[PDB]
Amino acid sequence: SMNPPPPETSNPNKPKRQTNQLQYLLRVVLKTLWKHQFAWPFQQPVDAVKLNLPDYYKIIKTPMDMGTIKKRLENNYYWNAQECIQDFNTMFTNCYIYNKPGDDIVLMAEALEKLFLQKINELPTEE
Numbered sequence: 001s002m003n004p005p006p007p008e009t010s011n012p013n014k015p016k017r018q019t020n021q022l023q024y025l026l027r028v029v030l031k032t033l034w035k036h037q038f039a040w041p042f043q044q045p046v047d048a049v050k051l052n053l054p055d056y057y058k059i060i061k062t063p064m065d066m067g068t069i070k071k072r073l074e075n076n077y078y079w080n081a082q083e084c085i086q087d088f089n090t091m092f093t094n095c096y097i098y099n100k101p102g103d104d105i106v107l108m109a110e111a112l113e114k115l116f117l118q119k120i121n122e123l124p125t126e127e
């Protein structure tokens with residue numbers, strides 16, 4: 001029932017790049033999902049205490065959220081686009097694992113994920 005430390009957003013010895021695909025992931029993908037009416041539950045790590053989800057981090061062992069993704073993008077934490085795309089997919093998948101079909105939060109994730117997929121479809125070719 002306690003919260004873990006959030007996912008890493010800073011790690012100086014981790015190799016980093018800024019690529020045109022990673023720029024797109026910030027300026028288009030993250031920006032698009034962040035402004036959405038259903039973004040707010042996903043804008044920070046799940047607070048299992050405040051939300052009264054004592055089992056959450058006993059079930060979800062790779063937590064992820066857009067707050068974390070936003071910091072990772074702003075701090076140029078990634079090596080490539082795939083790492084960032086994986087974080088979004090982890091966020092959506094966690095929601096679907098933990099909750100049940102038709103739950104409000106699942107409907108919210110589904111709407112964000114639809115947009116996510118539309119934007120990743122238009123991912124620019126590298127460099």
Ligand SMILES: O=C1CCCN1c1cccc(NS(=O)(=O)c2c(F)cccc2F)c1
Pocket residue numbers: 041042046051053094095098099104105
């Ligand atoms: O699974 C996830 C990922 C992001 C938040 N989340 C989740 C799952 C279950 C309950 C809550 N608690 S909440 O934020 O107050 C909330 C509700 F209680 C009902 C509908 C939407 C909500 F956001 C949050």
